[PDB]
């Protein structure tokens, strides 16, 4: 279904005024209810990290409580930047595709080449998953992006964060 606990990066979505830590795993108690977004990491759902030259970096966040980081990801439009900041790099993605409603059992949206995204082959992707409609957990909403810049921290913030 969709939805250690150690925070290892920061997710920035400038259009949504979102800055939020990413932790390993999608536990409600240890991660999402702590106001963080979670990297799918267990039960066969483990996805690639952004530093991999190909893969799908999958993340889950709350729609409606604890800082509600993904409450408005349906307001993203093609080209809107999504930035993952790590100790060593900035990974800049741009929004590419949206699946506004799907079954919580539809885990194939986290595949290396995510099903239903319209992506044709291997690339470097990000997947954001949250609940829909608001204040329920009936369905899931999925937003996908594609990497456009891998930037060493020594080069300062990417344009997207300024």
Q: Which of 7, 84, 28, 10 is nearest to 52 (CA)?
A: 84
- Structure resolution, Å: 1.9
Q: Which of 12, 39, 71, 131 is catalytic?
A: 131
Q: Which of 46, 25, 44, 47 is nearest to 36 (CA)?
A: 25
CA distances for 40 relative to 23, 26, 129, 158, 162, angstroms: 9, 6, 10, 26, 29
Three-class secondary structure assignment of 66-123: CCCCCCCHHHCCCCCEEEEECCCEEEEEEEEEEEEEECCCCHHHHCCCCCCCCCCCCC
Distance separating alpha carbons of residues 50 and 106, to the nearest angstrom: 22
Distance separating alpha carbons of residues 21 and 6, to the nearest angstrom: 10
C-beta atoms surrounding 33 within 10 Å:
12
Q: Which of 162, 152, 104, 96 is nearest to 124 (CA)?
A: 96
Cβ pair 17, 31 in contact under 8 A: no
* Cα 19 versus chain centre, distance: 12
Cβ pair 140, 129 in contact under 8 A: yes
Q: Which of 149, 103, 157, 104 is nearest to 126 (CA)?
A: 149
Q: Which of 12, 39, 62, 124 is catalytic?
A: 62
Paired sense of beta strands 7-13 and 18-24, if any: antiparallel
Rg over alpha carbons for the chain, rounded to the nearest Å, is 14
Q: Which of 39, 63, 124, 140 is catalytic?
A: 140
Of how many residues is the chain composed? 162
| 151 catalytic per annotation | no
Cβ pair 127, 102 in contact under 8 A: no
Helix count and strand count (H, E) for the chain: 0, 8
Structural domains of the chain in order of their starting residue, each with its CATH number: 1-162 (2.40.260.10)
| 140 catalytic per annotation | yes
- Residue showing tokens 């082959």: 121
């Amino acid at each position: 279904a969709q939805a250690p606990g150690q925070g290892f990066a920061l997710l920035h979505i400038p259009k949504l005024d979102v800055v939020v830590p990413i932790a390993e795993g999608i536990s409600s108690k240890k991660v999402l209810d702590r106001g963080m977004v979670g990297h799918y990491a267990e039960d066969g759902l483990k996805t690639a990290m952004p530093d991999a030259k190909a893969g799908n970096f999958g993340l889950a966040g709350h729609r409606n409580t604890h800082g509600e980081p993904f409450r408005y990801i349906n307001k993203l439009e093609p080209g809107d930047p999504i930035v993952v900041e790590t100790q060593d790099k900035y990974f800049v993605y741009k929004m590419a595709s949206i699946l506004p409603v799907t079954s919580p059992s539809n885990v194939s949206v986290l595949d290396p080449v995510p099903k239903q995204s319209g992506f044709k082959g291997p690339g470097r992707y990000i997947t954001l998953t949250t609940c829909t409609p608001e204040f329920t957990s009936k369905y899931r909403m999925i937003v996908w992006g594609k990497m456009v810049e891998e930037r060493p921290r020594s080069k300062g913030k990417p344009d997207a964060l300024v």
